[PDB]
């Protein structure tokens, strides 16, 4: 898989952040409290909500040749939609609900595969050494 772009609004220190990801090594430099950390959290929320780790998160990624887009908005209440790109427009891949989207993602890119094979965090290194 590959990430293409993420938009984060009103999440932690992010008021309106947009980050594009490209091929190769994408380096995100920042000091503590800069928002670099919360940006990765927004991506995790975007992909795997619900999980524990107006807020708006829009993430576009690529998987097996198909371009996907997950959009979440936390008002009260919450809105969730996951679509696929077809030609020039985005179409729902499943019911626009938290449970349906979460079930779809666990089949498309299981959470355990993401944390065990993609996401590297300090805790894992510490555990290894």
């Amino acid at each position: 898989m590959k990430l293409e772009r993420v938009t984060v609004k009103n999440f932690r220190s992010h008021s309106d952040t947009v980050v594009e990801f490209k091929e190769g090594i994408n380096l995100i430099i920042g000091q503590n409290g800069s928002g670099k950390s919360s940006l990765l959290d927004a991506i995790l929320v975007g992909l795997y909500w619900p999980l524990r780790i107006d807020t708006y998160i829009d993430l576009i990624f690529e998987k097996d040749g198909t371009k996907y887009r997950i959009t979440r908005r936390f008002l009260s209440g919450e809105i969730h939609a996951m679509k696929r790109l077809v030609g020039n427009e985005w179409k729902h891949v499943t019911e626009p609900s938290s449970k349906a989207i979460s079930a779809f993602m666990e089949k498309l890119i299981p959470y355990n595969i993401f944390l065990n094979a993609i996401y590297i965090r300090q805790g894992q290194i510490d555990a290894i050494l």
Partner: protein
């Protein structure tokens, strides 16, 4: 033993990657039922003997091994500040790993607080708090 076969495979993958990350200084990584040991001059040694940069190389080599073991290939890799403490040795090792290995991966997202790593990257952005909100600056 199924457990032994798995730890054995992971050790092989980790050995190749670690040997590459250390220019062959260490010939292999041994996974004991779970503790890790490295081979130097034909002898298995405890991790306590590794220097700073070599610890970073080992931790990453092992993670990358698990990644290959489980997914069969690596498309995307996200390093969320896995090694925040960075001295001279650690930094040089990370830069070396970046330009010689990580650049072989389709997509790598590296989050760090070290400006010096920018030269070993393909695309760079700086994020900082400005007037209370995160601001993104595209550097490359």
């Amino acid at each position: 033993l199924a457990r032994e076969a798995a730890l054995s495979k992971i050790g092989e993958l980790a050995s190749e990657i670690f040997a590459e990350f250390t220019e062959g200084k260490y010939s292999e990584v041994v996974v004991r039922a779970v503790r890790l040991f490295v081979v130097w001059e034909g002898k298995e040694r405890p991790l306590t003997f590794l220097r700073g940069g070599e610890r970073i190389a080992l931790g990453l080599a092992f993670r990358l091994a698990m990644s290959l073991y489980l997914a069969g290939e690596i498309s995307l890799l996200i390093l969320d500040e896995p090694t925040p403490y960075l001295d001279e040795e650690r930094r040089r090792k990370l830069i070396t790993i970046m330009e010689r290995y990580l650049k072989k991966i389709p997509q790598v997202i590296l989050v760090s607080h070290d400006e010096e790593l920018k030269d070993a990257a393909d695309h760079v952005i700086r994020i900082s708090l400005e007037n209370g909100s995160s601001k993104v600056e595209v550097v490359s």
